[PDB]
Design a protein around this ligand. Sequence first.
Ligand SMILES: CC(=O)N[C@@H]1[C@@H](O)[C@H](O[C@@H]2O[C@H](CO)[C@H](O)[C@H](O)[C@H]2O)[C@@H](CO)O[C@@H]1O
Ligand SMILES: CC(=O)N[C@@H]1[C@@H](O)[C@H](O[C@@H]2O[C@H](CO)[C@H](O)[C@H](O)[C@H]2O)[C@@H](CO)O[C@@H]1O
Ligand SMILES: [Mg+2]
Ligand SMILES: [Mg+2]
Lengths: 133, 132
Amino acid sequence: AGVLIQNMSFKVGQTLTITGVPKPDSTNFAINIGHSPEDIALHMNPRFDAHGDQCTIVCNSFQSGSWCEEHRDDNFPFIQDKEFQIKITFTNEEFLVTLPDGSEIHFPNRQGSEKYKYMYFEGEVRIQGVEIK
Amino acid sequence: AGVLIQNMSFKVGQTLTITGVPKPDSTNFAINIGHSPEDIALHMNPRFDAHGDQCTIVCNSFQSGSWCEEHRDDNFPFIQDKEFQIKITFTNEEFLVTLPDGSEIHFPNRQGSEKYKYMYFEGEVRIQGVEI
Ligand SMILES: CC(=O)N[C@@H]1[C@@H](O)[C@H](O[C@@H]2O[C@H](CO)[C@H](O)[C@H](O)[C@H]2O)[C@@H](CO)O[C@@H]1O
Ligand SMILES: CC(=O)N[C@@H]1[C@@H](O)[C@H](O[C@@H]2O[C@H](CO)[C@H](O)[C@H](O)[C@H]2O)[C@@H](CO)O[C@@H]1O
Ligand SMILES: [Mg+2]
Ligand SMILES: [Mg+2]
């Protein structure tokens, strides 16, 4: 059940910096930001090869047993066993993900909250750094 | 009640860097590194004013339902509402804690595990940074 971080508050206006390395045999991995395992505002799922996607980032939200509408990005600067740094900023309106290569993903903050105290990193990735300021 | 981090891996050779800010009226805060809540290899507990202690760092370990012997340090480079960075290195022998001013604390690795997968931050502090 991967890396679980509880009560490290991520609020509107801060940057979340995630340092990690996909496992050498990674098919995919996910960053889950939300309130609980049943209420995820941002599911960000870089897929090397999983769910029928190859080198695709799938973003979605999960609430009350249900996945919502997928956002898909073909921009994929992740490599098996290579360190990455991802930045996440958010507003009431959306998450702004800055990827390693300086490119960006815009995903709506559908849950609408200004503070999230649940972070869950799942799948074939090692998390070396979580920074919030 | 405070920050719980499970399955982030701390190992001999690695630097653990904690970044945070004690609350303006912080009495104390604690960095817990172990296996479980019942098995704590390093409890590092800077006390502004708690348990009769002012401006003291208390280090200890918790196993089999008991605190072990305290290591107490009068060196206190912490200020309420000011950002700190704390670097922890460990070996089979000891945790080497590097304090914000470049001073160090030696605390024995009484557990002797070589890898820790449970971290719990307690008390009046904002944890801003956890990197291994
Ligand atoms: C084009 C396509 O549909 N693929 C989807 C899958 O992406 C989807 O897989 C789940 O997607 C959610 C996020 O939307 C999580 O990543 C979850 O772990 C995946 O299983 C599947 C199942 O919902 O449906 C489609 O086939
Ligand atoms: C001088 C002295 O020995 N005082 C101790 C207290 O420090 C101690 O309080 C506990 O200390 C542990 C670490 O050793 C934890 O920080 C815990 O939160 C404290 O309650 C008490 C109880 O063990 O014993 C003496 O008073
Ligand atoms: Mg006293
Ligand atoms: Mg010796």
